Amino acid sequence: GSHSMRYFFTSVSRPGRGEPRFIAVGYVDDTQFVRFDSDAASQRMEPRAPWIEQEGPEYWDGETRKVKAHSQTHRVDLGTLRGYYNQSEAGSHTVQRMYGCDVGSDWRFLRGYHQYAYDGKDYIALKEDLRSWTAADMAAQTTKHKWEAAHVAEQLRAYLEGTCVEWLRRYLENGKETLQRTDAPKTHMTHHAVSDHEATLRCWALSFYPAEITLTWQRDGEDQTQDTELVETRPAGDGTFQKWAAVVVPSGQEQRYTCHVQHEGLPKPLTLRWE
């Protein structure tokens, strides 16, 4: 079972309303475990899953210290970029940052990431080799030269390949029951007459973890990709996920159609058929 650790950082300027908004959230695979909100009263990194609540005050005091340092860099960054693009001080702008690491089924480093966007577009990203940078424009090229001269990539590499994966492993061990579990999908199908010569067949997958899943319809064993309505995998609210797939079936043809479900929590892919 491959795993990842990821932090997502959102910074938004609020012209004439004071300091910019800053949200930090941390995830292990598809489970959120911490948060920081600039507008909340605690002004601290806060637990968002029971298993991390067992870390003591040194852990929390340290994460709070580092999350405040991130916020402060993002506060200076909004003004730097604004100057780089010669932008007015009246418009609201958006900065986003994402970093983390993935490990494979052996729990060993597979890849590390550090990406950065300005107003929803790629601004600067660390390449896969963890030594070079991908700059989206001249403003970005200016950030690149700065980060190159301060040896930022080398510092990131030591974090993503070392510390990042070490703490991922610690987290996987500590939140074993939550994070090392798989919840196979609970499946069912519904049939709803739409008219008198056709009907909607819906295939459901519920209460599954993790979120990755393949849910497809076939007619005589042939893919119906183009003829399927497929919703985006959505969160149930309790740590599990849901998804459905539907097709409009001509009268008397229910038996030509099969619903296919692939998921980590299933020992063998399921083949369902209304009958």
Partner: peptide, 9 residues
């Protein structure tokens, strides 16, 4: 476990 330090753009 957050990284540190964090350099400006």
């Amino acid at each position: 476990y957050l990284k540190e330090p964090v350099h400006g753009v």
